[PDB]
Amino acid sequence: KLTRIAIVNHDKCKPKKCRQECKKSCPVVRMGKLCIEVTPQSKIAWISETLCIGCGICIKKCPFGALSIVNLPSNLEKETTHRYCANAFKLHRLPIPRPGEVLGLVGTNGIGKSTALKILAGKQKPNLGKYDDPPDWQEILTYFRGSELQNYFTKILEDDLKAIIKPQYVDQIPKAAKGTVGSILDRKDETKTQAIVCQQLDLTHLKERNVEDLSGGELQRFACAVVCIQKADIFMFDEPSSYLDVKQRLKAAITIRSLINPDRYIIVVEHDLSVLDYLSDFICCLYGVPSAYGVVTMPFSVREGINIFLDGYVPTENLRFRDASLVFKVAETANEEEVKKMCMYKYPGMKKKMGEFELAIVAGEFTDSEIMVMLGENGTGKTTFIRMLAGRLKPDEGGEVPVLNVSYKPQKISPKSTGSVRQLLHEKIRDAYTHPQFVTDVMKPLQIENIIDQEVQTLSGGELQRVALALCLGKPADVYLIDEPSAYLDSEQRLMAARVVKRFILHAKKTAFVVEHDFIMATYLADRVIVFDGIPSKNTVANSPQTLLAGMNKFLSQLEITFRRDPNNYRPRINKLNSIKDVEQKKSGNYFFLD
Amino acid sequence: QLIKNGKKITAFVPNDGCLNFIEENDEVLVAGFGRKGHAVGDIPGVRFKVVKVANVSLLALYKGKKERPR
Amino acid sequence: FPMKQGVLTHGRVRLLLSKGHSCYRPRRTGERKRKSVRGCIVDANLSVLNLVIVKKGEKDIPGLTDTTVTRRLGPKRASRIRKLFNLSKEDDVRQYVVRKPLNKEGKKPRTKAPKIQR
Amino acid sequence: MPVARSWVCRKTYVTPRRPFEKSRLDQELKLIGEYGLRNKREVWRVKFTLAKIRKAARELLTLDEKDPRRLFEGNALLRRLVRIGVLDEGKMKLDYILGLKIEDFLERRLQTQVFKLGLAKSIHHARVLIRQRHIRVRKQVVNIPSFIVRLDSQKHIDFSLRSPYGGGRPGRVKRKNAKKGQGGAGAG
Amino acid sequence: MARGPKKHLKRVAAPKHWMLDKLTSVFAPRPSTGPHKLRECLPLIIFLRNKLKYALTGDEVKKICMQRFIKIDGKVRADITYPAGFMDVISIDKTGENFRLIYDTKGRFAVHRITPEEAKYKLCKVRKIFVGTKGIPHLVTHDARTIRYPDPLIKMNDTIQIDLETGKITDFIKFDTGNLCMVTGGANLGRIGVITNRERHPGSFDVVHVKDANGNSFATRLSNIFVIGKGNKPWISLPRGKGIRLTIAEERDKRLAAKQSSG
RNA sequence: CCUUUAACGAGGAUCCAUUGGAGGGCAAGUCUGGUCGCAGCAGCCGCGGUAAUUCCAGCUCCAAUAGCGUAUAUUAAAGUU
RNA sequence: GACGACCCAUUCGAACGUCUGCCCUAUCAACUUUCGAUGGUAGUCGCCGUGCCUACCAUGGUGACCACGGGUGACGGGGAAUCAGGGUUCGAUUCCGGAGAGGGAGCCUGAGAAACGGCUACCACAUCCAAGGAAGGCAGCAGGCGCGCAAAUUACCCACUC
RNA sequence: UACCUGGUUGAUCCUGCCAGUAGCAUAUGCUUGUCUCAAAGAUUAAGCCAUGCAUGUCUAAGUACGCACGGCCGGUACAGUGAAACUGCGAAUGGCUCAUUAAAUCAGUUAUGGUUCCUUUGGUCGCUACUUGGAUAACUGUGGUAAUUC
Ligand SMILES: [Mg+2]
Ligand SMILES: [Mg+2]
Ligand SMILES: [Mg+2]
Ligand SMILES: [Mg+2]
Ligand SMILES: [Mg+2]
Ligand SMILES: [Mg+2]
Ligand SMILES: [Mg+2]
Ligand SMILES: [Mg+2]
Ligand SMILES: [Mg+2]
Ligand SMILES: [Mg+2]
Ligand SMILES: [Mg+2]
Ligand SMILES: [Mg+2]
Ligand SMILES: [Mg+2]
Ligand SMILES: [Mg+2]
Ligand SMILES: [Mg+2]
Ligand SMILES: [Mg+2]
Ligand SMILES: [Mg+2]
Ligand SMILES: [Mg+2]
Ligand SMILES: [Mg+2]
Ligand SMILES: [Mg+2]
Ligand SMILES: [Mg+2]
Ligand SMILES: [Mg+2]
Ligand SMILES: [Mg+2]
Ligand SMILES: [Mg+2]
Ligand SMILES: [Mg+2]
Ligand SMILES: [Mg+2]
Ligand SMILES: [Mg+2]
Ligand SMILES: [Mg+2]
Ligand SMILES: [Mg+2]
Ligand SMILES: [Mg+2]
Ligand SMILES: [Mg+2]
Ligand SMILES: [Mg+2]
Ligand SMILES: [Mg+2]
Ligand SMILES: [Mg+2]
Ligand SMILES: [Mg+2]
Ligand SMILES: [Mg+2]
Ligand SMILES: [Mg+2]
Ligand SMILES: [Mg+2]
Ligand SMILES: [Mg+2]
Ligand SMILES: [Mg+2]
Ligand SMILES: [Mg+2]
Ligand SMILES: [Mg+2]
Ligand SMILES: [Mg+2]
Ligand SMILES: [Mg+2]
Ligand SMILES: [Mg+2]
Ligand SMILES: [Mg+2]
Ligand SMILES: [Mg+2]
Ligand SMILES: [Mg+2]
Ligand SMILES: [Mg+2]
Ligand SMILES: [Mg+2]
Ligand SMILES: [Mg+2]
Ligand SMILES: [Mg+2]
Ligand SMILES: [Mg+2]
Ligand SMILES: [Mg+2]
Ligand SMILES: [Mg+2]
Ligand SMILES: [Mg+2]
Ligand SMILES: [Mg+2]
Ligand SMILES: [Mg+2]
Ligand SMILES: [Mg+2]
Ligand SMILES: [Mg+2]
Ligand SMILES: [Mg+2]
After folding, report:
1. Which residues form the Glycyl lysine isopeptide (Lys-Gly) (interchain with G-Cter in SUMO2) crosslink (chain D)?
2. Is residue D11 part of a domain?
3. Domain assignment of residue D10, yes or no
């Protein structure tokens, strides 16, 4: 049932002294098929990832401690709590919600996170994975007798702790709801906790900045403010750092952590860089195969869990084979030609409004041949810039009208393709290539397969965003306009998408402007950068495209964050805003190491 | 070839046409024959017999009560 | 890592501390541990120093000395009281005890005092 | 862990050594037919409870007379036998115990008395009635066919006071059909 | 491990004469340290709920004893596992009844109500004699009492009648041939008879004979004899049947004739 | 949970008894169809080479029965320690 | 009346010592000793008796009635299965005794420990890190990996026995 | 229940074993309506271990100025409930396992006249005084480290 495999990593595997009893009796080698690859030589005895039966005879008879078992993942049909529908994604057992502390979850996009959250909140009853005749709270509360779920599900059936939850998507709720500015917040739950969340989330402007005014980052901040003031006993937070300021991630973290104390269950799920270590106390890692089946592990501590998620990829019990050490592209290799045909498509320092936003410009020596990256806080107008360049306000008092053709990526995810996406893949065509730019980008998490034939309304935002990227670089254009492309993506597919678009357009010595709020893609896309300085609601100045180091220095010193690069995996981490390191880095200004 | 020892032994298959259920390189659970150390009957030097092929019986694989898990 | 009196170095060292020592609080009657402490010498490789004023000059430090001492708390052993108000052997030790005044935004005000012991 | 339990239990029969022996199979089948029992085991129980009496009897009879132990335990064993109607007070001595046959313990069963005291049409009908809670010993319903009737309990066996056969509401069949005259034959 | 004294007692390992059941639970009361040996005692908890039925569970015994109702030799004992034992005189004032712990002839304690003009004195058996500092003679009884200045004719193995408000021995019976005796150990437990003999094997366990009121004789060890009477006249009151230890062939006849199957 | 009780709840084609055998040892067929020293059975003796009481199956019959078969250690049989 | 306290007794023990009692092996017939082996004298030490340990002295002690060495899928016993009479085989396992908390070693506190739900160090493992440092012991109850022919729920409660 | 039956031969009488036969306890196969009991990670690996829990404790009677709550106004030993904290006691019992270990452990039998003993029970308590000393915790306030019952 579990697929057992043998592995060989060892202190000096000795194919020069042992005489290789390792290969002289694997049962599969005897019958012709080669399981093991070694003779008298100098180095490691190779082994097939699949030709050992899991016999274990490979292990009993090496003289040195070279060989051992691992358990490759399989679909067991044991502890199936739910199936997304009949024949769909299979969900195994749930994490037991420890009270008094924040329970976090981590995993790749589309493995069973939001279904687990919807089940734990009583909004989805368990069906025990049956296609037909889903049970009704007598066989449930017998399927997990002798288990904590026996009592937990009754406490939510008599609503003695009636749950409350936050949504997955930011773009839905300001259309689905109705309420004028401030009065919705006042009439919802309270005034007291209303007052403390409002100030510590820095949304005190939304006494008069309306629900139609506010941006998707400001909407996540509203969604989190409203669920925090909502009076309930158990809480959940799906993606609570989707489109936020690099300081305001930690401010969200603190304002959720401020409700830990009074015997309240809380679960959070994130695609985190350095934020959840302050958010959660225990971790439960997920493994499986995307939108096919997903398994939940037993609890771990924060550092221990975050580590068994990427300091290798083995539980203390079993195995999985994904999420290895590449959270920084250590492959420092970049080469393309210099060309003296260069176009310097400069622009004036035009000053523009809408009702409230003074967002000044200074001129910049923008050129055709490479990408320019953009920095800045949320809500400072890094969006309106290239929205105005795309045929909107102030092209008249200066404003360089787009010289090359425009590919627009909008950040509000709402493609109007009812039916399936396949017909929206007709205002383009794929047939223009069948090539690495398309394959290595669109495929990695499974294949191109799930994103050809599907109604875009039931879509994981990740692959819809991969299609919006594909129809952006699939349109007749050359100036590509981008806005948080990394959102709604995991870590490794974020970097896949970043790397492959850099490489693809740099084949052509071609234009793009990128809007980021993250680090990794921003750091491996750049040789020049613009910065937004000043605080929102009054003023902002888009400084000219400077170098990388001094630019993001102006950035971080304005945000007052420094970073640390662990060499073993080149991992980034936040220094805690006051440290024996947060003094040298803040005296020398260095927040970027190992160029 | 046994799991724990690793040593090699020959075993009988106990009914008409069973040798088709036994694929190659799967597990099996061998048992004794019936005289505690000695070859039984007309067979020269075979001292063990199969009961389970892959967590399913032979008596059920052969009477039809179950089918191979694949 | 703190500093403790009598470990003559500028380095840091590991000592087997017990009850009555400093830089240690024992969790169980009759216990000992082995922990790291810095030598008593002072050098630029610190992070803080505690200094206590012994002789004050003439110019008042702006935010340290101009303030006033609180009422602290009064004595509770009988002879301590006698020694403070220079009382005779047969002066009443009652009446003199420091009647702690008590005010809050709730109830009526009050005066407390300690139960006198000897 | 230490625990507050009795593990004490025991077996109440012994299989025969010759498994297919005709003189045995035909006698036991005769005994099953003549008293309406269920297995062979219902006979091996009686064989055991007799062959165990016949060991105490023998080991006493191999003591010397006038012994304290032999006197006390013999006077106790004969009393216990006489009290269930397996022995005659006109015998009352150990050298008679060795003359008892299996068909005297079988005879004192409640199933046997319920037939032989007249309350049922056959030895099979009796086993059904007892198991249906139709009979009572002394102000007490019983439900076990193998119950052994003590000598002076004999004349107490009679039909239960909450039962159709003598002072009781008709059962769920005689009532479903009398209702077919007023719910199936009057307006149905 | 064992590195120090134990403090629990398992139900099976408990003494037999406590007549405890088997299926209540794994433990037994474990008498606390006292004047009486652990096997010879009877804790106060076992006397109130297994014998007199006054209480029902351990907590009811604890809240009967806390109200200061029970008296063991005049004093007021509040410990429910206190080790009462042979010659101790429980008094329950709030009811007006008294008891004497004496072995019944099957070799176990039984309830034995006594008249309140008797529950003022109890007997003790002398265990030691020594001359303290300055030349004061002392005494040690079987229940650990120490009497200072006793009469200079009371010796070992004798019996003394004390009072419960003073100590201060009043009478004493001397161990020799012809006096009554009750036996407090081994096979013959709770039998009575005149001593009639004493052999003496120097250095090992001198042996003693006895003789019932029906000719029956039965030896014992001297360290198990307890004189209770001058001769043929027991000082303290006796339980029904008076230690006669009838055989089972007689016990059956009385059971049958009395037909004691009801009341 | 068991016990105590109202109301529904049996016509047998279900509110369905199984596990191993049928030459001998050892209770039970010198039935019918198939295979042809093959496939197989068989603890032991032994069955199968075109007319199988022993293989594969139908029918019938046997033993124990809410249980029965197999592998193994051990005891009696063993006066074969 | 509560508490504390010297010593004596008593209680719960603990410790050391006497007699008798053990599975297989001769392809184990001699073993033991200034690296104390048996004994004497005086001490050291210890809660006390004692080669327990030191100094001097003597040359002893054990063995075909099996010493000494080796093996045990050996923790001992109350007991379990079968059993004419005699016996054979089993006893990790709820009661009693012993021994141990990954392996060896040293000690604090205490009436009581050579204690691991105590501390210190070496050996083997393993966790966190800002690379300076810190932390660990399920052969307790559940639970998980591994191992294998082979063994249950990460539930409820102090109401019963204590 | 003090028991045998098949097999070397053309047949017979023997020695002699292999096979059958009955119980027991570990595994496993097929099957399963009721009801009372109830064993269960010993065998291999005394191998390794995520998370939670398994040892704490206040009376009339050691120390109460937490305003924390508090009443009839007063502490004039000082009321009264009482968090915390010093102090005392317990943590050496219980539970788990069977690696070690063959005159060892263990059993019955005896001895401490060769020793120690918290506690309980009973003895014992007479060769500035109307009451002495300084110093800590909780509490107030300032802190250090990424991190700990620092
Ligand atoms: Mg630091
Ligand atoms: Mg007040
Ligand atoms: Mg005082
Ligand atoms: Mg213990
Ligand atoms: Mg120990
Ligand atoms: Mg006690
Ligand atoms: Mg059949
Ligand atoms: Mg057959
Ligand atoms: Mg047939
Ligand atoms: Mg046959
Ligand atoms: Mg026949
Ligand atoms: Mg033919
Ligand atoms: Mg034919
Ligand atoms: Mg035929
Ligand atoms: Mg035998
Ligand atoms: Mg000497
Ligand atoms: Mg000496
Ligand atoms: Mg010699
Ligand atoms: Mg010699
Ligand atoms: Mg030896
Ligand atoms: Mg043994
Ligand atoms: Mg062993
Ligand atoms: Mg016997
Ligand atoms: Mg044992
Ligand atoms: Mg073992
Ligand atoms: Mg066990
Ligand atoms: Mg034990
Ligand atoms: Mg002992
Ligand atoms: Mg271990
Ligand atoms: Mg102590
Ligand atoms: Mg230790
Ligand atoms: Mg312990
Ligand atoms: Mg510790
Ligand atoms: Mg340590
Ligand atoms: Mg532990
Ligand atoms: Mg466990
Ligand atoms: Mg397995
Ligand atoms: Mg099992
Ligand atoms: Mg298993
Ligand atoms: Mg309790
Ligand atoms: Mg021949
Ligand atoms: Mg022949
Ligand atoms: Mg045999
Ligand atoms: Mg059988
Ligand atoms: Mg039960
Ligand atoms: Mg068992
Ligand atoms: Mg084990
Ligand atoms: Mg733990
Ligand atoms: Mg109080
Ligand atoms: Mg008070
Ligand atoms: Mg304390
Ligand atoms: Mg203590
Ligand atoms: Mg266990
Ligand atoms: Mg040992
Ligand atoms: Mg030996
Ligand atoms: Mg040895
Ligand atoms: Mg000995
Ligand atoms: Mg003993
Ligand atoms: Mg002994
Ligand atoms: Mg105490
Ligand atoms: Mg005293």
Report:
1. 93, 139
2. no
3. no
State the Cα–Cα distance between residues D171 and E127, nearest whole angstrom: 80
Q: Measuring CA to CA, which residue among A59, A63, A58 is closest to residue A18?
A: A63
Instruction: Collect residues with CB below 5 Å from ion ligand 2.
Output: C 110
Classify burial at A79, counting beta carbons within 10 Å of its beta carbon; exposed 0-12, middle 13-18, buried 19 or more.
middle
Angle at alpha carbon of residue A546, lines to A542 and A547, rounded to 5°: 145
**CATH 3.10.290.10 for the E2-117 domain, yes or no:** yes
Residues E170, E163: contact at Cβ < 8 Å?
A: yes
Could you count the other beta carbons within 10 Å of the beta carbon of residue E5?
6
Nucleotides of H under 7 A from a protein CB: 1, 3, 18-24, 28-31, 37-39, 49-52, 63-65, 67-71, 74-78, 90-96, 110-111, 118-124, 131-134, 138, 143-146, 149-150
Do the domain assignments include residue D80? yes
Residues A521, E195: Cα–Cα separation, whole Å: 109
Q: Which two tokens stand for residue E239?
A: 């339980």
Domain that holds residue D146: 19-181
Q: How far, in Å, are E31, E88, E105, E223 from residue E39 at the CA level?
A: 9, 16, 18, 16
Q: Is the dihedral of CA B8, B12, B13, B19 positive or negative?
A: positive
Q: For residue A522, give every residue at least 6 positions away whose Cβ sits within 8 Å of its Cβ, in sequence order, or none.
A: A373, A375, A514, A516
Torsion of Cα atoms, D97 then D103 then D105 then D110, to 10°? -160
Neighboring chain E residues of D68 at a CB cutoff of 8 Å: 247, 249
Quickly give E27 CA vs G115 C1' distance in Å: 26
- CATH code of the region E122-172: 2.40.50.740
Residues B31-66 as b or e (16 or more Cβ within 10 Å = b): eebeeeeeeeeeeeeebebbebbeeeebeebeeeee
Contacts of A206 (CB under 8 A, 6+ apart): A181, A182, A185, A198, A214, A218, A222
Could you give the 3-state DSSP secondary structure of residue B49?
strand
Number of residues that make up chain B: 70
DSSP per residue, A345-407 = ---------SSS--EEE-----BTTS-EEE---TTSSSSHHHHHHTT-S-SSSS----SSPEE
Residue by residue, DSSP assigns C10-27 as: SSEEEEEE-TT-SS---S
Distance from the Cα of residue D29 to its chain's centroid = 18
Contact call for residues A61 and A25 (beta carbons, < 8 A): yes
User: In angstroms, rounded to a whole number, what is the distance separating the alpha carbons of residues A208 and A227?
Assistant: 20
Residue B32: phi and psi, rounded to 5, are -80, 170
Q: What's the resolution in A?
A: 3.3
Map tokens 């952006």 to a residue: A472
Establish if D113 belongs to a structural domain: yes
Contact, A424 vs A451, CB < 8 A?
A: no
Residue corresponding to tokens 């390191």: A581
Does residue A509 approach strand G to less than 7 Å at its CB? no
- D57 Cα–ligand 41 center, Å: 53
Please check whether residue E230 is in contact with residue E179, taking contact to mean a CB–CB distance below 8 angstroms. yes
Dihedral angle over CA of A545, A550, A551, A552, nearest 10 = 160
Residues A502 and A520: beta-carbon distance below 8 Å: no
Please state, as a whole number, how many other Cβ atoms lie within 10 Å of the Cβ of residue E156.
12
Count of structural domains, chain D: 1
Output the known binding site of C for Mg(2+): 110, 117
CB-nearest to A31 from B4, B25, B26 is B25
Number of helices and strands in chain A (H, E): 17, 22
Q: Which residues contact A7 (CB under 8 A, 6 or more apart)?
A: A47, A67, A68, A69, A70
Q: What is the DSSP letter of E224?
A: G
Domain ranges of chain E: 2-117, 122-172, 175-245
